[model samples]
Target: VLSEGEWQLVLHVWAKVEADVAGHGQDILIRLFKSHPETLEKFDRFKHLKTEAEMKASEDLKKHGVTVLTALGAILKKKGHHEAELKPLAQSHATKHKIPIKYLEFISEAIIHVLHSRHPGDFGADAQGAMNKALELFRKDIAAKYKELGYQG
Candidate 1:
């Protein structure tokens, strides 16, 4: 749960990066898979790509990346009233996607990294802190939903 000011700060910085959701989203996933190569195995569409260049060049990767970032953008827009947005997403990922909760942590970390790399000056300490808190909340919500759906693993 973000304080009012923190929420505003996050929105402010998020607006700056919202324009290039596809590029930033792809970068976030790339960094995540780079740091934790095993996680790449979870993506059937992307797992065949053996190299970073291949991942970057793939159109499917770009489309999926945009999908991910767009979802986050929707979550941000709804602010505290995002349970409607989260539930279906959490259910699909937990059951069909079979995504582990820990991967959300990895993606959250990558989101911050990508934001900082793209807009270092705009997304400074304060905005980073706010975004971190926001992602923390988002992760916890998904984890709780996963637990309810009996997909703890």
Candidate 2:
């Protein structure tokens, strides 16, 4: 997972994207999910779970949370090769979620857990560095994802 400070950085970016795009982040999320299904497996599962029943019976990724998020989570597990990466656009969803600065810690932790477990040095020269780099570039990707989604509303 990334450090709390780092996640704050991400949340900051995610919230920005969310606000600019309004509700269109959901559409971007859908594209991410379809583009990268493996990410759906590492979700924290409790953050935005719909229900106990939904979580218990959760087998399909589609039934889970926003598509953009899962894909983002999964993509962060690597150093690229992820078409729908979200670390770059983390701020896109943070503000609307009312995510506190502390929550950035949680996001960082989750990201570290996912990326460390999935990729390791094989994914990049330095785990922390790579993630930091990803977060730094999140806003740029948000614009790209928004464009890909044809967000004109």
Candidate 3:
């Protein structure tokens, strides 16, 4: 749903963020768990870490962070054809990972926060709006899978 220009803008900014995914991506996950403590429960391996420092040093955290950012990049890389890309990811998460639709919203919010934090004034309101719209679309597609299985969350 992005305008042509917005697509380029998001892709360009996201490319910059991806280049430093180890730093910004990990921070996003950290911030997400910090804000939504119970969200950590979704990942049993990560839920046991009681402190931020412990979480940061854990190799699994880094791996998952990279995985998350890389997955988002794949979703974005689909350009005008996100439904085709997101459906498989949605099905995989819903079936294999047992990830609920709500987590996608949390992830989207966390990513937007990371984008704002990492880029300062580089992204304006329009850019933020575009990203929000994109995430909403992604969420909707993922949510459809949950609905099919009668998973309300």
Q: Pick the candidate with the highest TM-score.
A: 1
TM-score of each: 0.96, 0.34, 0.90
Model 2: per-residue Cα lDDT at residue 76: 48
lDDT of each: 0.89, 0.42, 0.80
Candidate 3 displacement at residue 1 in angstroms: 2.1
Model 3 worst lDDT window (10 residues): 79-88
Q: TM-score of predicted model 2? A: 0.34
Tens-place lDDT per residue, model 3, 1-153, is 777877777787788887788787788889889888867888877888889999889888988898888888888877657777777787777887787777888888998988988886666777787788778877877787678876647
For candidate 1, the C-alpha RMSD (Å) to the true structure equals 1.0
By summed lDDT, the worst window of 10 consecutive residues in model 2 runs over 22-31
Model 2 lDDT tens row, 1-153: 356555444444443333433233333333333344433333445334444344434444333334545555455444344544553443454433333333333444454444444445333435356456665444344445544554311
Residue pairs with backbone overlap in model 3: none
After superposition, candidate 2 runs with Cα above 4 Å error: 1-62, 70-95, 136-153
Q: Which candidate comes out best when scored by lDDT?
A: 1
